[PDB]
Symmetry: D3
Subunit: 92 residues, 6 copies
């Protein structure tokens, strides 16, 4: 109960701040859907390329799954930074 | 004309790849709007806090504009990483 | 009141989870003190180097204040990532 | 012997600079201990959740081990940036 | 054909801009070669250390392959940021 | 004298390791030159665009100097990560 008063640096948030944070998180959910769609595209591309040595090698060299994971991480940490800008903890 | 054939590692993109890239960029435009709204909130909060020494000091210590800039950069580079996952350049 | 139930993805935390999060934040406070000490060192070094053109140029070329700001940002975002590992939001 | 004179951009460090660098590295060791404790917590949580399909799925969706690895990397690179602010190499 | 006119924010590039972008990408290829050489060094070091428990443990604790992967990612995203500085998209 | 024996986690480096580190740093110097050339291009572009309101606004919106600074930071930290992969400190 009222666990935020127990966590260092956290403060009481207004309804406006909570609403802005939730807007960030909902836009993030949309990005999650998009990233899942891209991952499905990559799976289908790899499948359609089976036993095409040159195209499989091209895909492997491009490393698209690693780049998608990098992008997902960046989107999530950007979300966290914006939410911190809104919520403004009282601590380092 | 056909400048992509002149840039190292770039390749001919299908309509599906272009569409996915544009989906990423349009979601990014939505994030740009959200970030502008948060920046307006920060400006209004700072203005309403003028000549309240303690609250101005709290805002300054929280560094919300710096955190918003960090978040914007992360969102943009995440977008670029996802677009790279889609477009798959042929070079390092 | 009970604002965490209003924020997307947040959940009820056990006392153990709150304690671990606060441990992260207290270690972060120690890092804040260290970073302040380094900044004081940089200020004193620059002051003691006044009207020594070569040493002022060396300091300017090394960009130590920019590197200290990069380090501070990395420590803070690492803290946030560890706290996310502990608290485990239910959302993207 | 005196290998720093062989590495581009490195310089002779004062005792004060070495002491500050070691302070950064010792605080980092404390963070290493904390991260190990969090990893042990995650292992125990996963073990206690065996054959609870919903809770295992929740943990998997939260990706806590990946977030702990991200946090560890950020702490380490922040340390390196602060140490660079102290030591100030003479090169890009 | 002329696919850049179909992608949001992209613009017509001058020959000078294309040349600068390709300079970035060629320097990046040189970094790719260097990273491959370091990876070969790591493989040879690990091989020469087989059945030397202490040295294998030292290598494992240092995590050199993970640090090489972090460095590769940073070089690639730095390249992308410089290329963005040159090409200057019209969108977020 | 022999300052590396005083810094936590540092070790004695072979000539081969020092050579690889210096190769990384020299490639980095080449990147420094390239980044300076891009910055000169940006200055000249801005100058040639004086009193062209639309083009000045386009440049300002693209934020090319900020993207060049992001790229420089990424290249430098990637260098540091590769050098860490080579040198392999004994500490966190
Ligand atoms: N046809 C293609 N084939 C293969 N891969 C492709 C491709 N088009 C794009 N990519 C990949 O997508 C990456 C990210 O593109 P983004 O548009 O997000 O980020 C781009 C964009 O902001 C900018 N840029 C590139 N071309 C541009 C143009 N014609 N006009 C304006 N900005 C441009 O430069 C940024 C970095 O470009 P970079 O090449 O380093 O990184 C590119 C490249 O790896
Ligand atoms: N009431 C408040 N007052 C002041 N500042 C506030 C605040 N609530 C959040 N913040 C700030 O927002 C940052 C990012 O929150 P986010 O939810 O994106 O990222 C959060 C979230 O993913 C997770 N988290 C925190 N509490 C949680 C909970 N109850 N349930 C689940 N996950 C939680 O931990 C992440 C990192 O938290 P961290 O504290 O390091 O970083 C927080 C903190 O600096
Ligand atoms: N004597 C000196 N003069 C001027 N600047 C100095 C310096 N000693 C260190 N620095 C600066 O500090 C940066 C970070 O050092 P750190 O020990 O955190 O991170 C180091 C450390 O993990 C590793 N490393 C360097 N020398 C090592 C050694 N002898 N043994 C083990 N690891 C070593 O390589 C990492 C990256 O090194 P990098 O040179 O790229 O980046 C170095 C360099 O810019």
């Amino acid at each position: 109960d009222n666990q935020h008063k127990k966590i260092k640096g956290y403060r009481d948030l207004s309804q406006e701040e909570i609403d802005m944070m939730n807007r960030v998180k909902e836009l993030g959910s949309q990005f999650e859907k998009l990233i899942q769609d891209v991952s499905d595209h990559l799976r289908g591309q790899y499948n359609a390329s089976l036993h095409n040595r040159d195209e499989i090698t091209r895909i492997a060299n491009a490393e698209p799954g690693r780049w998608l994971a990098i992008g997902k991480t960046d989107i999530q940490t950007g979300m966290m930074a914006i939410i911190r800008a809104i919520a403004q903890p009282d601590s380092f």
